[PDB]
Amino acid sequence: RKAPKSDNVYLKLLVKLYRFLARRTEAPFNKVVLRRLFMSRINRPPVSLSRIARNLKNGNEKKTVVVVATVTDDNRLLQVPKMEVAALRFTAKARARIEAAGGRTLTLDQLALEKPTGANTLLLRGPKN
Amino acid sequence: IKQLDAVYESKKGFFLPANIVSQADLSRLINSTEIQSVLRAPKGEARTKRAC
Amino acid sequence: NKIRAELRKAKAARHHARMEQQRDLLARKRQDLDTRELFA
Amino acid sequence: EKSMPFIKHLASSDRKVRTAALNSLHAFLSARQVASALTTLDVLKLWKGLFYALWMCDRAIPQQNLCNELADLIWQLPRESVATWLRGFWATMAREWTGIDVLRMEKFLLLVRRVLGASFKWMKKGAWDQSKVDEVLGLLAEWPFSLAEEVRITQSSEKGGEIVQKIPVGMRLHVLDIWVDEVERVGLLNEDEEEARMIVQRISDMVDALEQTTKSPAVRTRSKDSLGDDRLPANR
Amino acid sequence: NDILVPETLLKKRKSQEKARAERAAALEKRKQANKEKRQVI
Amino acid sequence: RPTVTVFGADGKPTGATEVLPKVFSAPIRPDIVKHVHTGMAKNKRQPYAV
Amino acid sequence: HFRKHWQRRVRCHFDQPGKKVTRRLARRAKAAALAPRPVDKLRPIVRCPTVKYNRRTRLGRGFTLEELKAAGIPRLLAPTIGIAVDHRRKNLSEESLAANVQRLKDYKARLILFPRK
Amino acid sequence: SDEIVWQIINQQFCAFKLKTTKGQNFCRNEYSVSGLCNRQSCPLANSRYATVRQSPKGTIYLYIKTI
RNA sequence: GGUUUUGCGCGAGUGUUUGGGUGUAAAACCCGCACGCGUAAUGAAAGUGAACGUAGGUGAGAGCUUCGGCGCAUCAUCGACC
Ligand SMILES: [Zn+2]
């Protein structure tokens, strides 16, 4: 598009970073992440701890889970597995429960340094409506 | 200043918010060794010459 | 009157299950290198 | 435990206080009985203060000779604690790599070069002690060139926990670009002496194994450029 | 007391050294291809 | 930055230093500040009517 | 529901901070007259009536005459030492009696009583 | 936070700005190489900066700002 | 008082501002208990009450890939339970 709808100055910081990465890298991961940054808050539904566990429970373990949305906690998920999640935002319950399981929490700018081309990443988004 | 750490730990229902970016310096993000190593070659210049 | 009794017992149980939720989630809230202590 | 009354003066805003704090750190490492009891926690406090000592350095000439001074601390220690000292530096660099601004990044890239240069120069007396080459190279195989993506500090017991540190890719790329000319500076690239190719070989196989086993495209490209340097004995 | 070149500028100079050599090599290939294209048409 | 320097009544540092609180590392969000200051300036207001 | 003249019976609350400071000065003036005395009176622990609120207790109106007698506090002296009396309430259970008697003995332990003239 | 300062300076308020109707904006800050307000020449939003000034006695100095 | 969309805060929770504490006094700051809306549904009702399959299989599908294969959301179908 042309301008992000958000008034967050750090969300405009991330759009500036992923505009540069989408232009100067063949990886369609950067183009997809940049498209979802421009999208509104309703079009980025929250993703729960239970939903990122099912997409991990296959042979997709040891991959950096990337969710360009907020991460919410599920009280019905009794045990959290070890997992590295990069997201826009984390709730306090979610952040504590990844850290209790031995996992790590990343931001999208820490993702861009580590995996600029989006290598070995599991991209997820939440339920629409 | 010693009190200032205490008063923000005592407000109920409020924690100190986590930023959505970890490093707010864009020039460290983009002009870094990690990003510039995987970039393509430039397709053009800032000034584009008029062909015809 | 057995109908009116369980209607009163219905909204009593919804209220009681709501308060047990608040207690359970409150209990969920319960479960040398740092700069503030090294440079103090 | 130990008394460390000078770390908070290392991060002071006055240069005279920082210079006085460095001297007290210099004399603290000269204490032979204390440095024999140096464990991994106190070197992490020490390097955290030394990180902020460089983080407060002002101009280019004071930055360069400060980087030389921090590399020169390798000789004041006793032999038995050089490994735990050098473990603490790479743990500090890994922990605080991303959160350095651009204008402060240049002097910290100089500090890795100086510490790596002083470590390679500490290998000398066969003209190289095989026990001394083993710790400095095994540490090259664990912090910069690891096949694993994480390093565990301390062990698991009833008396304490553990510290897990993720290795940033930027440190991997920086040491990849500067390892060739650091062994050139000490003299490892002379083809005559029997030992010299052995350290150069087993350094180069440990990065070739990093090129095959990694999953980051940045490392795979940069490891190929480090192996393809025209000063190496293989490509000559 | 000689002010050393920044390490960030050293690796920028190295990439610019490669980029100039690649452009110079591609220009010679373009010049030979243009000569053969001229004789064809 | 870990610490800040304390200045006395003469304007010179006294040598004492204190750590900076984590509130000084909070995000700076001019949209949130504008949203709240617009509303906070209203709460002092006094009603008028014809 | 704007069927009647809502404009002539609309009440606004611009005096909400004004009533607050007036309320605080009434409590202030109450402790000015009763200077060592507290500003309130002792109220018993009472169980809320309906099945929705069975499991929560609150403050009631005053103590039972049997609750004053078990705690050793006389009935015609109790209002003068800051204890509210309610002759309408009955115990009906030992648990309501034992909880409020224990409250009166705790008030008795904390109390400083002054001798007449 | 050098970029975050610039976003506040450019798009919220800056006490040194002079907005003219002639298609250019001016910086009134005395430590600016050009009088114009842009990203390159704002000394507040550039941690590393240089400026050439002239003294009342006639001496010309060069000023240096570091992070 | 409803309803749609954009931004923002927190997020299975959320909402201090009836009131209390406080104050540099109609401002700002703090919150003890309840309360509103939401967090499981259906049947007229008695009332009952969410797993047999990585909460299932198959095919698409963004993205990733050790190039072998993993597969978001969503849809189609065959199922499973109440
Ligand atoms: Zn300006």
Side-chain angles (χ1 to χ4, degrees), chain H residues 6 9 14 16-17 26-27 36-38 41-44:
Chain H
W6 163 245
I9 288 327
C14 186
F16 305 106
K17 264 199 286 215
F26 280 74
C27 211
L36 316 178
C37 201
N38 45 58
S41 83
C42 215
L44 307 197

CSV table of all heavy atoms in Angstrom, one decimal, chain H residues 6 9 14 16-17 26-27 36-38 41-44, ligand 1:
chain,number,residue,atom,x,y,z
H,6,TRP,N,13.4,11.6,15.7
H,6,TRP,CA,13.1,12.3,14.4
H,6,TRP,C,11.6,12.3,14.1
H,6,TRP,O,11.1,13.3,13.5
H,6,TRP,CB,13.9,11.6,13.3
H,6,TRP,CG,13.4,12.0,11.9
H,6,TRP,CD1,12.8,11.1,11.0
H,6,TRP,CD2,13.4,13.3,11.3
H,6,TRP,NE1,12.5,11.8,9.9
H,6,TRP,CE2,12.8,13.1,10.0
H,6,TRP,CE3,13.8,14.5,11.7
H,6,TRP,CZ2,12.6,14.2,9.1
H,6,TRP,CZ3,13.6,15.6,10.8
H,6,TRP,CH2,13.0,15.4,9.5
H,9,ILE,N,10.1,14.9,16.1
H,9,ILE,CA,10.5,16.2,15.7
H,9,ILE,C,9.8,16.6,14.4
H,9,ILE,O,9.3,17.7,14.2
H,9,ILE,CB,12.0,16.2,15.5
H,9,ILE,CG1,12.7,16.2,16.9
H,9,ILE,CG2,12.5,17.4,14.7
H,9,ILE,CD1,12.0,16.9,18.0
H,14,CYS,N,8.4,20.8,16.8
H,14,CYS,CA,9.8,21.1,17.1
H,14,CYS,C,9.9,22.6,17.3
H,14,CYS,O,9.4,23.4,16.5
H,14,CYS,CB,10.7,20.7,15.9
H,14,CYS,SG,12.5,20.9,16.1
H,16,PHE,N,12.2,24.6,17.0
H,16,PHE,CA,13.1,25.3,16.0
H,16,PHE,C,12.5,25.4,14.6
H,16,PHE,O,13.1,26.1,13.8
H,16,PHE,CB,14.5,24.6,16.0
H,16,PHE,CG,15.1,24.5,17.3
H,16,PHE,CD1,15.2,23.2,17.9
H,16,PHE,CD2,15.7,25.5,17.9
H,16,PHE,CE1,15.8,23.1,19.1
H,16,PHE,CE2,16.4,25.4,19.1
H,16,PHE,CZ,16.4,24.2,19.7
H,17,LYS,N,11.4,24.8,14.4
H,17,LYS,CA,10.8,24.8,13.0
H,17,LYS,C,10.2,26.2,12.7
H,17,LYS,O,9.7,26.9,13.6
H,17,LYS,CB,9.7,23.8,12.9
H,17,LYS,CG,10.2,22.5,12.3
H,17,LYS,CD,9.0,21.7,11.7
H,17,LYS,CE,8.2,21.1,12.8
H,17,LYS,NZ,7.7,19.7,12.4
H,26,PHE,N,12.2,25.7,7.6
H,26,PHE,CA,13.5,26.2,8.1
H,26,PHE,C,13.7,25.8,9.6
H,26,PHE,O,12.7,25.8,10.3
H,26,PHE,CB,13.6,27.7,7.9
H,26,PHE,CG,13.9,28.1,6.6
H,26,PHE,CD1,13.0,28.1,5.5
H,26,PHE,CD2,15.2,28.6,6.3
H,26,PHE,CE1,13.3,28.5,4.3
H,26,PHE,CE2,15.5,29.0,5.0
H,26,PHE,CZ,14.6,29.0,4.0
H,27,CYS,N,14.9,25.5,9.9
H,27,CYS,CA,15.3,25.2,11.3
H,27,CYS,C,16.0,26.4,11.9
H,27,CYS,O,16.9,26.9,11.3
H,27,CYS,CB,16.2,24.0,11.4
H,27,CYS,SG,16.1,23.0,12.9
H,36,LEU,N,17.6,24.6,6.7
H,36,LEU,CA,16.5,23.8,6.3
H,36,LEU,C,16.3,22.7,7.3
H,36,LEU,O,17.2,22.1,7.8
H,36,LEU,CB,16.6,23.3,4.9
H,36,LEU,CG,17.1,24.2,3.9
H,36,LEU,CD1,17.2,23.6,2.5
H,36,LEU,CD2,16.2,25.5,3.8
H,37,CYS,N,15.0,22.4,7.6
H,37,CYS,CA,14.7,21.2,8.4
H,37,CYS,C,14.5,20.0,7.5
H,37,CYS,O,13.4,19.9,6.9
H,37,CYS,CB,13.4,21.5,9.3
H,37,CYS,SG,13.2,20.5,10.8
H,38,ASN,N,15.4,19.1,7.5
H,38,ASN,CA,15.3,17.8,6.9
H,38,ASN,C,16.0,16.8,7.8
H,38,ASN,O,16.5,17.1,8.9
H,38,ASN,CB,15.9,17.8,5.5
H,38,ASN,CG,17.2,18.5,5.4
H,38,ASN,OD1,18.2,18.1,6.0
H,38,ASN,ND2,17.3,19.5,4.5
H,41,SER,N,20.0,17.3,8.2
H,41,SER,CA,20.5,18.4,8.8
H,41,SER,C,19.9,18.8,10.1
H,41,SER,O,20.2,19.9,10.7
H,41,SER,CB,20.4,19.6,7.9
H,41,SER,OG,19.1,20.2,7.9
H,42,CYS,N,19.0,17.9,10.7
H,42,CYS,CA,18.5,18.2,12.0
H,42,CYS,C,19.5,17.7,13.1
H,42,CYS,O,19.8,16.5,13.1
H,42,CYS,CB,17.2,17.5,12.2
H,42,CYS,SG,16.0,18.4,13.3
H,43,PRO,N,20.1,18.6,13.9
H,43,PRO,CA,21.1,18.2,14.8
H,43,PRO,C,20.6,17.4,16.0
H,43,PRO,O,21.3,16.6,16.6
H,43,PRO,CB,21.8,19.5,15.3
H,43,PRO,CG,20.9,20.6,14.8
H,43,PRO,CD,19.8,20.1,14.0
H,44,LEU,N,19.3,17.6,16.3
H,44,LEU,CA,18.7,16.9,17.4
H,44,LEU,C,18.4,15.4,17.1
H,44,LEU,O,18.6,14.6,17.9
H,44,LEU,CB,17.4,17.6,17.8
H,44,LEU,CG,17.4,19.1,18.1
H,44,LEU,CD1,16.2,19.5,18.8
H,44,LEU,CD2,18.6,19.5,18.9
J,1,ZN,ZN,14.6,20.1,12.6
